[PDB]
Design a protein around this ligand. Sequence first.
Ligand SMILES: *C(=O)[C@@H](NC(=O)[C@H](Cc1ccccc1)NC(=O)CCCCCN=[N+]=[N-])[C@@H](C)O
Ligand SMILES: [Cl-]
Ligand SMILES: [Cl-]
Ligand SMILES: [Cl-]
Ligand SMILES: [Cl-]
Ligand SMILES: [Cl-]
Ligand SMILES: [Cl-]
Ligand SMILES: [Cl-]
Ligand SMILES: [Cl-]
Ligand SMILES: [Cl-]
Ligand SMILES: [Cl-]
Ligand SMILES: [Cl-]
Ligand SMILES: [Cl-]
Ligand SMILES: [Cl-]
Ligand SMILES: [Cl-]
Ligand SMILES: [Cl-]
Ligand SMILES: [Cl-]
Ligand SMILES: [Cl-]
Ligand SMILES: [Cl-]
Ligand SMILES: [Cl-]
Ligand SMILES: [Cl-]
Ligand SMILES: [Cl-]
Ligand SMILES: [Cl-]
Ligand SMILES: [Cl-]
Length: 454
Amino acid sequence: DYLYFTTLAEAQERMYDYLAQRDNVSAKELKNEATQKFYRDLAAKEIENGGYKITTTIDQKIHSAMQSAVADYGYLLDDGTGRVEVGNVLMDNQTGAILGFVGGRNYQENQNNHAFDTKRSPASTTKPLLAYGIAIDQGLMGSETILSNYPTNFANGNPIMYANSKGTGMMTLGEALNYSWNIPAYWTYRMLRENGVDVKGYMEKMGYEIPEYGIESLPMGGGIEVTVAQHTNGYQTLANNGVYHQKHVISKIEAADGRVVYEYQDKPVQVYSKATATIMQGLLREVLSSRVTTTFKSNLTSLNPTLANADWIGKTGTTGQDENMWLMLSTPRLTLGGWIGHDDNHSLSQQAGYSNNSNYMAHLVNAIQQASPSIWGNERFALDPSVVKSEVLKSTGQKPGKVSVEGKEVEVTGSTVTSYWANKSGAPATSYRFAIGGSDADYQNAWSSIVGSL
Ligand SMILES: *C(=O)[C@@H](NC(=O)[C@H](Cc1ccccc1)NC(=O)CCCCCN=[N+]=[N-])[C@@H](C)O
Ligand SMILES: [Cl-]
Ligand SMILES: [Cl-]
Ligand SMILES: [Cl-]
Ligand SMILES: [Cl-]
Ligand SMILES: [Cl-]
Ligand SMILES: [Cl-]
Ligand SMILES: [Cl-]
Ligand SMILES: [Cl-]
Ligand SMILES: [Cl-]
Ligand SMILES: [Cl-]
Ligand SMILES: [Cl-]
Ligand SMILES: [Cl-]
Ligand SMILES: [Cl-]
Ligand SMILES: [Cl-]
Ligand SMILES: [Cl-]
Ligand SMILES: [Cl-]
Ligand SMILES: [Cl-]
Ligand SMILES: [Cl-]
Ligand SMILES: [Cl-]
Ligand SMILES: [Cl-]
Ligand SMILES: [Cl-]
Ligand SMILES: [Cl-]
Ligand SMILES: [Cl-]
């Protein structure tokens, strides 16, 4: 089954490193293709013949419950576009340990491992990690910052689209995330590029490989393809108050006589500040509660109302032609990554991610809890003490004060709201260009509307 071959493949790679070091093979010698083939074959025979003890992070009751869940409820994914394939990884947020996974609908019918082997764009689940999370971390935005969703074009003249919408106007970060509007994510990433932020530094600390960081649609998942296991590791980082632990299934390999061939070594990395991570947790809580892009909270409330009252956060994604849907879920204890799609990349139904994957993942979450009642935990995500709280205008996401609007000094007042920041000073005073992004026309239409209201 999936677990046997995933474990065997990883143990063979660790045995390869061990044997080459044992036999004092130089890194140069190791570049020789014939030497490499010999050491791969030797590693395979050592595992096959050698009576090694492989210790995995797999919780057998949970992993077994996940296999029964996809066997019993995988048909809930079938949406009239043929048999829908699936990958899920359940990860301990404090360690990066993989407790269980779903490799696909049925190993016996299709052996492709959709948790560890298959790479697809994570689509709009990129946004919290690569755009908004980094912007907050760099003190370029807070929880109630305003972004432009006004119509705008990619460099090649194509409109930035969201379903059939060419865009609306100004909106909060919260609305931008709840809906997964695309234009606000585009502007956030353009701001990071313009400011020369080392985005690669963040993404590589979490083990992502992105070839071209200049892609305009990077936050929407253009120019990124990931395994479910890797992408689960990204969300583990946000859930774990910004501290990455490298994903692993193997914790140790020992010879029969107890000599250590390999032992996983924890190497925690603070990728985002605690302020940034805990702010993003609060935003991703509302993504699920708002139910705009996923029915997950409705599905889970019906299956298991007590589990639905755990502190769920997450994010959805849909690739361009609905070929791939994602739902990433966390409680403080665990992250569960979910992909669905077709092996031949053809389109899913329009609602496959919104409804079908949401219902299936509610069933998977329920099966995990029934197998291991305390595993999700009852702990809440909470704002770090280092978070800065700023009273800002609802209309500008910045502090009340004076702005020049067409000659005339204007006193900007009105509804205020607490905005969470991950810098020292918090939110700035309202300036004319108060939003992330927008044209001089957009600002003319945003200020008309705000001036109208004073
Ligand atoms: C996040 O899930 C958003 N998805 C997108 O914006 C995707 C990004 C993407 C595109 C291709 C591969 C991988 C990722 N793009 C679109 O949805 C664009 C829609 C098509 C409009 C242009 N029509 N044409 N031709 C989600 C919230 O939209
Ligand atoms: Cl398996
Ligand atoms: Cl496998
Ligand atoms: Cl176990
Ligand atoms: Cl893809
Ligand atoms: Cl434009
Ligand atoms: Cl909203
Ligand atoms: Cl970069
Ligand atoms: Cl990657
Ligand atoms: Cl670059
Ligand atoms: Cl591993
Ligand atoms: Cl031995
Ligand atoms: Cl910190
Ligand atoms: Cl809710
Ligand atoms: Cl709903
Ligand atoms: Cl309860
Ligand atoms: Cl989405
Ligand atoms: Cl297919
Ligand atoms: Cl809180
Ligand atoms: Cl404060
Ligand atoms: Cl303040
Ligand atoms: Cl500051
Ligand atoms: Cl900007
Ligand atoms: Cl303009």
